[PDB]
From a paper:
The purified protein was shown to have NAL activity and the kinetic parameters determined were similar to those of the E. coli NAL. The pH profile for the wild-type S. aureus enzyme shows a typical bell-shaped profile with a pH optimum of 7.4 and two pKa values of 5.8 and 8.7.
NAL catalyses the reversible aldol condensation of N-acetylmannosamine with pyruvate to yield the sialic acid, N-acetylneuraminic acid (Neu5Ac). NAL is a class I aldolase, functioning through the formation of an enzyme–pyruvate Schiff base formed with Lys165 which carries out a nucleophilic attack on the aldehyde carbon of the open-chain form of the N-acetylmannosamine.
Author numbering:
A (entry chain A): 1 to 137, 147 to 293
B (entry chain C): -4 to 138, 147 to 293
C (entry chain B): -1 to 138, 147 to 293
D (entry chain D): 3 to 138, 147 to 293
The structure:
């Protein structure tokens, strides 16, 4: 039977060597850190946070495989397979489905000015070919046309608009809404999201769980205080270059967090003192 | 000199006061009093926010704005909080309106960010400082970065902010950086998210017709009945969505006509409520008992 | 030829000098208006647009500026009165006034601040026209919408200010007999070859001579020389933008012995920290 | 070669599985040069549906286009990609085929810093040793990029004529090729050394006259051809530019195939309007 997809997920980070090749041992450690240290429900694999759009197809497969290998059978797995290359997307979708990922997701085709019908049929084509459940990333009338499909089970919701989130939550009580803005987890929780996916949950998963639980449980003031504490972290990490900095924090716990893939630059050492201070203040 | 002025706290829910006009764009004073009183008595709101965007303030001449301030003041009792929006691209006008509202006893002034031209931050800062300087009243600014907010809030008479930016990350940063300043959110459709974000209150045009629900959202959310708070936000957003699609100011005033209020017309160039919307409006009023 | 083209030419968007209390300095205003015509050699004045700090003024001040500008120039000089306002009663009042004064046309900024519908924008123009019976220049809305506005016999043209040369070309093709005056001084040469009938600019108060050469040279196919003057004009425009356009333009005018006064607050005065850079600009281009 | 002149942003025909049609592609390449009379081909740009391709299809496009045209034809290889290893692999491959210059889109999607954008360009240059054409960014930053002797110019696509004028006089010895077909005459009088465009695949003769006549001071006749060209560009845009431009080529007996999904094919509800355009302008 299919797992329940509600929960909190680490948007999985990927460690690279000097030549932009995946470091499999570090990747394994990052996946395990998300589940075993940060106590999260699931991995969201090959999203933006994993520098996925910097990868070739064979690299994306290697990440899908290492992540699955790293976690137990009860860990929820969502495979972001979106690409401007629909043939690649279908091939990654099939491969991830065959590995047993619980659901696929796919970024809105981007760069070019695709029409809505082009966007809709890119999702439907991926579904036809893979037969896996799908999570999308649009007017309400358009969401409806997408959500009308039984295999589009939900949306990874990342646009910062709470009026549109509310309208969608209302219109589609039967669909999974997983929010993607860590810095607004508490507002997303009270807006009825079914969970969230975040890159900072790799280092701040415990506080994230409390915000989500406390807010649902009606303890708003304490959830909001933890949102304050979390946003210090998020703001700091953002100002230092978010991917390298998150991986520098993980490096600090003994994980082989490697480098970002160029053209991303590595963590700038002039930020080291400010980062050490953050780690100490929030015991990261 | 010797009079004991009631120094009101400015927390709570405020109607952004709507204004009824005749065919020549003149203020219908008697409809205004009705609208002001609906807000306080029927809608059970804490205060009136006067001569904001909602009151078609930027369509008015200086005399009409003074007129609006006087009539809203007349129409309510001494327990009602009053904030006077006095912002204008004409700073002399803003100072004039600021003095006149303060003399009437308005509890605070507010002023929109100077607009149209690309003013620098130094110019926006000094607009606010010049109005405060000439009126000596407390001032609520509009939303500018956190560092600039810090310079602004370092003025003792800038007591708070009418926050309309749809950004809950910046709202949270502001709430944390300035725990002792007043924050009133201006997005009716996100009142529940503002509340759990620690706003002190809210100003809205739809509170003229949905203030009872608005209060329930505000209270239930703070009491941690968040599920019930949100369900009332769903309902409210049904309303707000509908009225936005028909033209917010005329439609809101058409909802007040139905209560027997003399809601008149919007000022041109605003067009009247289009009768082609009449049947959907009637249906919305019916389902939500407005 | 069409009578819609009567108002072709090059216009100073008239600057206004104020005292410390935001009051109009009438004599310096006269000097600015005369400088535009006599020194800069322009065809006309565009009076009470944004450049004149119009939206900072009360109704009486806008009338004052309309009156003095008109008094300062001869009957040969072309006059356009920007009367647009969020207050349509004010707009109509200013319109009648400017018309009775003998202004050749009215113009009006697109209703702003609120999200007005197109139908609301259109009837704002239509109400001004009906109440004033003057010719009207609109501001830049799709071509289908332009087609609707330009069907009014009293809407003679557009003061075109969108940075978009595809839309302009489309407009110029679709309305060969309407007036098009461009409002971007830094793209005058591009507007010219795109068939504009003229231009309205704040920088022509200090650089109207180069501007006329750009316009004439480019219409004459002397594109290289015309472009070289745009390079010149763009050093000037870019420099002045970096220092605060209205106070800086007025400072250049003070350098010529004109009583240029101050910007109206909340605009701040020329910041002395730009003094050396400005002087360097004035000497380089002989301004 | 001197890089001045007019280039077709090369279109690519696909079959229903999104595989390159090599014969139609050779035909498209040759139409640009022989029929449209252009100086060169801009290869694997956005117009070629490049960003929908895998690495092997991109190589395939570079090879076919180069083998399709004479030695005297100017060739620029767009190799930009979010995958820098891929960009560098493509840059080496296109360089070894003999492309006269590389170009690379600005790294996109993620909020890259300027330092990241800069060194992406410099890393590609370092590894390929070919000349590079950047995409467009402040003047102080252009200066940092153009300080590099191998960064020989910019494909300028943002229709801001203030910034373009600023760049032209700041960098009078660098190459500037504009990317907006609908504003070619404004670009020409602003001193561009040439242009790259998708619509030049069907309308390259008018475009040459616009370029030439405008520089000859025959400004009104240049502008008239721009009116005519903008009727075409407008129409083509309203129907879906790439499938429509390819449909125009198909009218000429070329095997113009299909767009790669998720682009959809030409919608036949547009056929009559397209027929009338082709008749009106002899396309
Ligand atoms: Cl992600
Ligand atoms: Cl308001
Ligand atoms: Cl102006
Ligand atoms: Cl291209």
């Amino acid at each position: 039977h299919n797992k329940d997809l509600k929960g909190l997920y680490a948007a999985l980070l990927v460690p690279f060597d000097e030549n932009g090749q995946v470091n499999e041992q570090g990747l394994k450690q990052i996946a395990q850190n998300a589940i075993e240290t940060e106590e999260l429900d699931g991995l969201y694999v090959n999203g933006s946070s994993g520098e996925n759009f910097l990868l070739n197809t064979e690299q994306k497969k290697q990440v899908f495989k290492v992540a699955k290998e790293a976690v137990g059978d009860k860990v929820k797995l969502i495979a972001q397979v979106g690409s401007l290359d629909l043939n690649e997307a279908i091939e990654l979708g099939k491969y991830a489905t065959e590995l047993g990922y619980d659901a696929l997701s796919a970024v809105t085709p981007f760069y070019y000015p695709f029409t809505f019908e082009e966007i809709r049929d890119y999702y439907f084509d991926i579904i036809e070919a893979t037969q896996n459940n799908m999570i999308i990333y649009i007017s309400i009338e358009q969401f409806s046309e997408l959500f009308n499909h039984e295999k589009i089970v939900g949306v990874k919701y990342t646009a910062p608009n709470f009026f549109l989130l509310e309208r969608i939550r209302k219109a589609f009580p039967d669909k999974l809404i997983l929010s993607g803005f860590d810095e607004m987890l508490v507002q997303a929780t009270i807006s009825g999201v079914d969970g969230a996916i975040g890159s900072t949950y790799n280092v701040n998963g415990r506080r994230a769980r409390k915000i989500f639980d406390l807010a649902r449980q009606g303890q708003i003031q304490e959830a909001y205080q933890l949102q304050h504490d979390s946003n210090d972290i998020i703001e700091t990490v953002l100002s230092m270059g978010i991917y390298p900095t998150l991986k520098e924090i993980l490096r600090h716990r003994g994980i082989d967090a490697g480098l970002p893939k160029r053209p991303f630059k590595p963590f700038n050492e002039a930020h080291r003192q400010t980062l050490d201070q953050l780690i100490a203040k929030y015991d990261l």
